[PDB]
Design an enzyme around this catalytic site. Sequence first.
Site, PDB file in Angstrom:
ATOM      1  N   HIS A 147     -20.629   3.721  62.876  1.00 29.12           N
ATOM      2  CA  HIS A 147     -20.200   4.783  63.591  1.00 29.12           C
ATOM      3  C   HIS A 147     -19.345   4.001  65.011  1.00 29.12           C
ATOM      4  CE1 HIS A 147     -19.689   8.388  66.079  1.00 29.12           C
ATOM      5  NE2 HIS A 147     -19.872   8.965  64.782  1.00 29.12           N
ATOM      6  N   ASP A 190     -23.131  11.492  57.991  1.00 26.65           N
ATOM      7  CA  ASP A 190     -22.222  11.934  56.841  1.00 26.65           C
ATOM      8  C   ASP A 190     -22.400  11.100  55.620  1.00 26.65           C
ATOM      9  OD1 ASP A 190     -20.528  13.822  58.190  1.00 26.65           O
ATOM     10  OD2 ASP A 190     -19.534  11.895  59.331  1.00 26.65           O
TER      11      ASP A 190
END
Lengths: 145, 48, 428, 428
Positions: free
Chosen positions: C305, C363
């Site tokens: 991320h 995700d």
Amino acid sequence: LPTEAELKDFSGHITKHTLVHEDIRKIFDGFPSSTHPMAILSSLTCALTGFYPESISPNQTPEAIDLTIVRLMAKMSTIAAWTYKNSVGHPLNYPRNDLDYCANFLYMMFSFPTEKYEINPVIVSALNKLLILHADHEQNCSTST
Amino acid sequence: LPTEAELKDFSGHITKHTLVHEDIRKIFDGFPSSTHPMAILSSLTCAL
Amino acid sequence: MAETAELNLPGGQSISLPIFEGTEQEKAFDIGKLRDATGYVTLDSGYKNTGACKSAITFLDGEEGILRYRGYPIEQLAENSSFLEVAYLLIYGHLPTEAELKDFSGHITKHTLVHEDIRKIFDGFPSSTHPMAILSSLTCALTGFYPESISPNQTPEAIDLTIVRLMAKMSTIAAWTYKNSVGHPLNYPRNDLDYCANFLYMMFSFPTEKYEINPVIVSALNKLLILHADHEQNCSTSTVRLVGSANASLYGSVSAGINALWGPLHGGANQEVIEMLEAIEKDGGDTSKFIAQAKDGFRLMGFGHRVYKNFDPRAKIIKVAADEVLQALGMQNSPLLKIATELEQAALTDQYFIDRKLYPNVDFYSGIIYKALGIPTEMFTVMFALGRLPGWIAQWKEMRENKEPIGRPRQIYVGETERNYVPMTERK
Amino acid sequence: ETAELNLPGGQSISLPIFEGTEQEKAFDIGKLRDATGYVTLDSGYKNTGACKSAITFLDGEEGILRYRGYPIEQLAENSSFLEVAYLLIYGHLPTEAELKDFSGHITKHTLVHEDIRKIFDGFPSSTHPMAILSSLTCALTGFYPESISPNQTPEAIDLTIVRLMAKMSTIAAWTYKNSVGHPLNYPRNDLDYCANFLYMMFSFPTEKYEINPVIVSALNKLLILHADHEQNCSTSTVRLVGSANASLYGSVSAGINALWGPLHGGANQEVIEMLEAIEKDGGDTSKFIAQAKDKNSGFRLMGFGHRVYKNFDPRAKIIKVAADEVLQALGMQNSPLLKIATELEQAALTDQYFIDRKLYPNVDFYSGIIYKALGIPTEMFTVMFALGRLPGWIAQWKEMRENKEPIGRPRQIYVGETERNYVPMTER
């Protein structure tokens, strides 16, 4: 003769696939109510190759052929009933999940959205018998075609 | 082999009838752009 | 207890800049007088060092893996709240009274029904159209059907109607984008299901197969959407605020945010996660070849991320739900779970992954739940948009209520100096 | 060379100076937040340089506008729309061959897919043209999925640009045809861009359309004057959305939604409404000039003021003169609306209140009067701004991608609640 599990998978797969693509319903929309049902049945039947181009690919696997078979057994029932609704100006019925093949055809053909349809097991079982008597006849003109 | 008059009537009649009914154009409207042309040719041909 | 900064611009000129301290000790210097007093602007690459606004909505600290909506930790909202409760919190600033959460969720139910003319617009999209084109194009259309929404001087009553209409209709239209792709008839929303259950019905129920509403799937979706509900300032949220600052409709500002979300650089929105799981299943289900060969992407496939260092605080909550979803279906020993666990334990134990901080993000797990439910790859960014929507709306509404001025930045021109038009004859 | 910034504590940072080719000056805050933990705070970016650009020089203090160093007055007098579109996008005046190539590609691509026409079929005639324009531009990413695929080749990008320049003209004419219930015209390959647009919009079967060279000239000039304006809201939207690697189509759709806001391109519709209201009231213009000075009377002087221009808008000075010429050349002596407009500027420019606040007419103040004279209805005025600004949006997007700008991620300062524990419903 299928085992109980073979017939349940075969009849279950057919039930799932009785739903016809929204674009085929829109092609169907073009046919005047006066059109002979056989014009619509034959015309919508050849459109299926266009929607399922894998059906005309060379090297059909047995799994792929099995899926073409349940698609056409399912969708012929739905489109056949559309040809009747078209002639009388009634709305199309979606197929049901809970009806066996012949009951679902009779429902799709004769149900209104204005009331619960009464399924008569005498008519369902008479239709099963009539379709069985017509299922095959060896090398006639249509089969040879 | 047609005479000049036979070919002129045959080719003239064909010219007149090349126009396809508005309802067949509306059936045609239903086919996605991705559809193989042969699906449409065969399908519209049996609608006739 | 107020501080000051001193800027000394070459040539001898200097300016005093007031320092603003936020409620989590984020400091800014106010450059509100910079240009008028000095002739200078800042030059900031991708706004990376520019405080565009003050927000009371969401606090995020990537080094400390923290994330709060309106002060409430994300862990506690996910485990105990519902998507619409979190939507109310983000948008209106507080946890709703029983009557508030009732009326809100009730008004949203009533407005999930989309106008027959928008359905006719939808009829024109071919079945192969990517779902995000249809989501952004039909959201765009709503300003045409609700012209009051681009009126100057809308009552707060009117603005609240716009907010329930969009929360409502986004779920309907997202379900349409899926039906279009498989050729299935559209479902009318139901009056007797809650937000997430109505979405699952509208998406998955079809006349020829019994659809049962599994409460474990409902609970998992509520947590997915909660976890995507807001993420502070980012490309898409900044888009929604910027278009909003021009007094665009909420619908127009969200349409623009959806197109920003669709961009493959956005982060989060990476339909490559479901693509990964499918490409592996088709190649006989062997992870340790796709992994091996996907070195000789990764941010696009649910690994690492941009903001969060070490771990994504949303990730470990959706990990739980991802397990309960697999066990609530018949997938305990399915290829999905197998392929999932291999990928995840390359991430969480292969050093190459520990090195480049490619830990599984929210995700990676979201893409697993989505693949489990038969949500296709081309719907992944639509499910993202549907979760983020209440954040977009809250950020738009704050921007309006703080009467922020139109976003109109400056440049430094580095082009050609003055030269006369050459008529076409006299050129070459 | 550097500016030096002294923060509370010992902390001090050297921010490099950058000066452009027209002596605009900034300091680079690129490394600010990583070195200090501080950001700037800047509402509406009144003091922030979003980027370097070679496209358009804008001096707001003196009222100077150049496209690639060519004075606006000379391009507006002597150039054409597509020549200016070429210059903005590609960075030089085209050779005879380049302009024939560019306009030739644009002519081919003016035909819009039959499935986009069927999507258009769904919009009622009552729909505001900008809802239709934004929604169909949005759809285009659905029909040209290559436009969102990573690693766009320069050839690929160039085909996107000609496709959008072409189809925006056809679709803008559709939005008008929709409102009046007329059949759509197919583009005509034997007409130049502006004449083709005018034919697509105004030709209907039961009335002979004559191409009026006055109308064609007037349109070229107005589109040129709208073609680009540096880092305005809608252009800033297109760059922000585009920085996420969104399609040009998606980025321009977000731009159209920003332009629609009344604080931006939507103002031109509101100016003409103000002039019609003063016409109807019948009253002295000095009455409204006083109402305009009256802090809260309900009446604002629309089409005055600008974020950047603290002086005459060069576009307004050109359109003011051209309105006289065009109405004369068309047999429309004494537009009552033009008299009110010229009387409002006369009083405002001599009235000390306005002069102290640097309030001059902007591009929006006179443009409606000319569009009206070309036969263009009020509800198309912002569509005409979008059609003009398109190549500027395209130029800005293209330069943003060629500069390899990172995704746009503005910051906040959090001013909301500190960590607080979730409070279950029954306890509230």
